[PDB]
Write a structure and sequence with these properties.
Elements (H helix, E strand, L loop, with lengths): L20 E4 L7 H15 L4 E5 L2 H11 L4 E3 L14 E5 H9 L9 E5 L6 H15 L4 E5 L17 E5 L12 H5 L4 E4 L3 H12 L5 E4 L4 H8 L6 E4 L13 E4 L2 E8 L5 E9 L2 H8 L11 E5 L12 H9 L31 H12 L5 H9 L20 E2 L2 E2 L1 E3 L5 E3 L13 H12 L3
Parallel strand pairs: 1-6, 2-4, 2-5, 3-4, 5-6, 7-14, 8-10, 8-11, 9-10, 11-14
Antiparallel strand pairs: 12-13, 15-16, 17-18
Helix pairs in contact: 1-2, 3-4, 4-9, 10-11
Bound molecules: adenosine-5'-diphosphate and manganese (II) ion.
It binds one RNA strand of 7 nucleotides through helix 3, strand 12 and strand 13.
Catalytic activity: Selective hydrolysis of -Xaa-Xaa-|-Yaa- bonds in which each of the Xaa can be either Arg or Lys and Yaa can be either Ser or Ala
Membrane topology: Peripheral membrane protein
Protein name: Serine protease NS3
RNA sequence: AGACUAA
């Protein structure tokens, strides 16, 4: 038994058995991250188990550190700074960090216990990680615990909460607004507002500030200096991307959720390419996670969730299912086994197995294009499997006529390392490297030979 | 688009 949000003395021996995958399917705010996880970790240390803890984002990682503070844990994330002796048997890192380590030339510890928090995360690295973890369990090499309020197959956008939630459907502005949305600024409590992009977040946040509102902007770019500020009394609005979709304990009163996002889609009609489709409705699991940011305080009973529109459950055309398989086909078990996708996430798209297997230098190039080149999984796969080296940027110019990249209606020119002037016309098109002007600048640096 | 950047 336990009290005071403190960990339970009693932990089930069942969850530590090899060949055992435990799905902890508990509602938002039940105590997965900050009460259950510490109990498991303390009991893992006593059992002397080589242990891996996985967070989807740095927001979840920071939440974990608060609960795990004092324990001999090795943090492998910029989100947390702590002294490490080097003899820690418990490692903590993000989902994508682990997949990266699995794809790189050196070698993950042989964990016999793996705890993945937010085991529904649809980021391609997270899906591939679940594939690895579930084969390790199947082989009898590890015990694993998957913690999530929205396990695969979740259709309920309004799950159980610690406190009653007032669900309100209203129109929500995507852009700045002069007028017509007084309900946003008339509210007295603290609001968490989910935006599909940092661009949209910028022009919504400066719109709120000119109304004398204290606004914190959260994303991958501002996390470091800004997340400690949410752990304060000095804010009205948190305008956040999906970095805060999971795990966050903002201690707020309201979530504004437009329930929209841009989705990468692989197009198969004609030459294969990636587009950014949408904005389209988010999944029921995303809506449920976002709503899960509030109604967490049993002493605070009038929290609000303001949303717009229905969710869209069908995401089979989302590129993350192909890309997860592109990664997992190149990940190997120490025994030699390529892992298969976690049960519930199989046949989201037409497999077939080992289709994305890369050889020798191609697998290294594949990883290098993602980690050093900052290119998406699909694009990196296409370049690597064509036998192109990481530093060979020819493919950025040899695309068919229709692949010519435009910026402000003008044909993009690249000046190369050697002073050639060439039109940006890549052989493979991925809208993620050209849609946003900031993304395109980075891709222009890549095409130059300067990345 | 968003997330991750470890050894
Ligand atoms: N720093 C804190 N101070 C007070 N309460 C907290 C703090 N962090 C989390 N909580 C509360 O503890 C409960 C469980 O938190 P958590 O473990 O994050 O739940 P879950 O991971 O299942 O969403 C929630 O009610 C949450 O609001
Ligand atoms: Mn949690």
């Amino acid at each position: 038994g336990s009290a005071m949000g403190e960990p339970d003395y009693e932990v089930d021996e069942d969850i530590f058995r090899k060949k055992r995958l435990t799905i902890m399917d508990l509602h938002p705010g039940a105590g997965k991250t900050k009460r259950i996880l510490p109990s498991i970790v303390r009991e893992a240390l006593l059992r002397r188990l080589r242990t891996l803890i996985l967070a989807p984002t740095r927001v979840v990682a920071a939440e974990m550190e608060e609960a795990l503070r004092g324990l001999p844990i090795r943090y492998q994330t910029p989100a947390v700074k702590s002294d490490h002796t080097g003899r820690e048997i418990v490692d903590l890192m993000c989902h994508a960090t682990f997949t990266t380590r699995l794809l790189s030339s050196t070698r993950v510890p042989n964990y016999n216990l793996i705890v993945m928090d937010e085991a529904h995360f649809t980021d391609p690295c997270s899906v591939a990680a679940r594939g690895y973890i579930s084969t390790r369990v199947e082989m009898g090499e590890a015990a694993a615990i998957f913690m999530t309020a929205t396990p695969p197959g979740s259709t309920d956008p309004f799950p159980q909460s610690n406190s009653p939630i007032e669900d309100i459907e209203r129109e929500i502005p995507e852009r700045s607004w002069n007028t017509g949305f007084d309900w946003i600024t008339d509210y007295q409590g603290k609001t968490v507002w989910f935006v599909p992009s940092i661009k949209a977040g910028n022009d919504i946040a400066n719109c709120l500030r000119k109304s004398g509102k204290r606004v914190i902007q959260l994303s991958r770019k501002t996390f470091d200096t800004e997340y400690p500020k949410t752990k304060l009394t000095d804010w009205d609005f948190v305008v956040t991307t999906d970095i805060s979709e999971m795990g966050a304990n903002f201690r707020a009163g309201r979530v504004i959720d437009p329930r929209r996002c841009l989705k990468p889609v692989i197009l198969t009609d004609g030459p294969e390419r990636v587009i950014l489709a949408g904005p389209i409705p988010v999944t029921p699991a995303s809506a449920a996670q976002r709503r899960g940011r509030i109604g967490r305080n049993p002493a605070q009973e009038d929290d609000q969730y303001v949303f717009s529109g229905d969710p869209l459950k069908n995401d089979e055309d989302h590129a993350h299912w192909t890309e997860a398989k592109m990664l997992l086909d190149n990940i190997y078990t120490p025994e030699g086994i390529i892992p298969t996708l976690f049960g519930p996430e199989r046949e989201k798209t037409q497999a077939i197995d080992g289709e994305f297997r890369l050889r020798g230098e191609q697998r290294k190039t594949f990883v290098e294009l993602m980690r050093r080149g900052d290119l998406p999984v699909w694009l990196s796969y296409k370049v690597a499997s064509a036998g192109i080296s990481y530093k060979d940027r020819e493919w950025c110019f040899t695309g068919e006529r229709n692949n010519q990249i435009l910026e402000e209606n003008m044909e993009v020119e690249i000046w190369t390392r050697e002073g050639e002037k060439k039109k940006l016309r890549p052989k493979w098109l991925d809208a993620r490297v050209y849609a946003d002007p900031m993304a395109l600048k980075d891709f222009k640096e890549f095409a130059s030979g300067r990345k």
